[PDB]
Structure formats: structure tokens, C-alpha cells
Amino acid sequence: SKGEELFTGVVPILVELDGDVNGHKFSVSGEGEGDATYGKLTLKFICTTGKLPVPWPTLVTTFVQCFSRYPDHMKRHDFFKSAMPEGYVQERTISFKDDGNYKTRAEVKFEGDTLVNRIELKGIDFKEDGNILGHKLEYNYNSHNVYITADKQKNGIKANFKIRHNIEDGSVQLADHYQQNTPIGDGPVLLPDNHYLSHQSALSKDPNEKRDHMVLLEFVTAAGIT
Numbered sequence: 001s002k003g004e005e006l007f008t009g010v011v012p013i014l015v016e017l018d019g020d021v022n023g024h025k026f027s028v029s030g031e032g033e034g035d036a037t038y039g040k041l042t043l044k045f046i047c048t049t050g051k052l053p054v055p056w057p058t059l060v061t062t063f064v065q066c067f068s069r070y071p072d073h074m075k076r077h078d079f080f081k082s083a084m085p086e087g088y089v090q091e092r093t094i095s096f097k098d099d100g101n102y103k104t105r106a107e108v109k110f111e112g113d114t115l116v117n118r119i120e121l122k123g124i125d126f127k128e129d130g131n132i133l134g135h136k137l138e139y140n141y142n143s144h145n146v147y148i149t150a151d152k153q154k155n156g157i158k159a160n161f162k163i164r165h166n167i168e169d170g171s172v173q174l175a176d177h178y179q180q181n182t183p184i185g186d187g188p189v190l191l192p193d194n195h196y197l198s199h200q201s202a203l204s205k206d207p208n209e210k211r212d213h214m215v216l217l218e219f220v221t222a223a224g225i226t
């Protein structure tokens, strides 16, 4: 399998994001590696412009589902590795309940030996001291299922899901995610039957890191097909 074969071992990852939320600009760089055999990602992000102006957890879904573990019986449903090495475009609208939204566009593709995710994010209509701009989210993350369906007219997939962000008082901020992936190349890809990715993510800090940053550990496995 062409794109499959790219993921058999440990693959270096680079992530670059440029953001503007309510007119506040920022950049983040990240790096680490992914091992699709285990569905495992390990990543470290740095805000290179100073302090991140939105909470770190609100960016986790934005910051590579090609590293998901597709069990053997589900391998024909793996759109993400089938689009490689040329890659795919991943767009989202992320609507924070009773608050603003992010729109993101990313390119995920091999650039030489490294899998690269380059993102542009634009956030509008946030409240000046709502959970996002007021930094009221706990520094943590919950497990979620990403329900994938084929988008055959775009030769890709759509996904819909809701992220639960725990709030420092015990309430939860929902972030509705509407996602569209289109391959960058012209040829055929694998278009899946309905299924889901089981995502889990754990956020931590590097004690020796004085920059605003996030260390992110993920495990992602496909499921929903027996």
C-alpha cells in the first residue's frame, strides 16, 4: 500500500500554525513524532510570539489523523494514509457554545521525510472575558469520538463531533467541530464507510521550558466497524 507504507514506523512531525483571534495574532511551532502502528503521537508546541492568547486545549484538535491506528479489518477505510504522500487539506469550523468560532485550514502532507501540518486559523466573535479569551478552561482534555463519513463529491471525508472542555468551576464549554478533508493530489483515494476515530489526548508541561508551551500525548484508534 503506497500511503500505508509511509506509516509503518516512527515518523517525524512538524506543526506550524498562524492564528488571529479577535485581531490578536500569534504563531505556534510544534514538533515530535507519530507511530500509527500504535496510534500514538508525541508532540511539543511553543508559542513563538509570546503568550498564547487563547487556551492551549482549544487548539489541540487543530494541531494529523493519518497517525491513527486502523485495525487490519478496517484498513480500506483509512482515507488519511491513502492521500499520502501528496497529502490533504483539512478545514474546520469550530463553534464554541455561546462564544466565538475558529475557522481553520491546514495542509497535511509529507515534505521530504517529515509529515507536516501547516495551519492557518482565524477566530472571530469571541467575548473579551468569556471562557476562551478569559482563559477559564482547565489544562486538560477528555476522550472523544470523531464520526467520519465519506464526502465522495470532494473525494474525501467529513467529520462532525463535539469537544468537551472542562471549565475551572466544574461547568463544561462545548466546541462543535465540523470538519472537511479533501486530498491535494488528483488520483483515487480510499473513501470510507461510516466509522469513528477514538481520540484520547493528555496535556502536560515541560518543567525546563520557560516559553508558553504544550506537551501533548495522543492515542487514536479507528472503530465502529465489526
Ligand SMILES: [Cl-]
Residues within 6 Å of the ligand: 142, 143, 164
Ligand atoms: Cl468528559
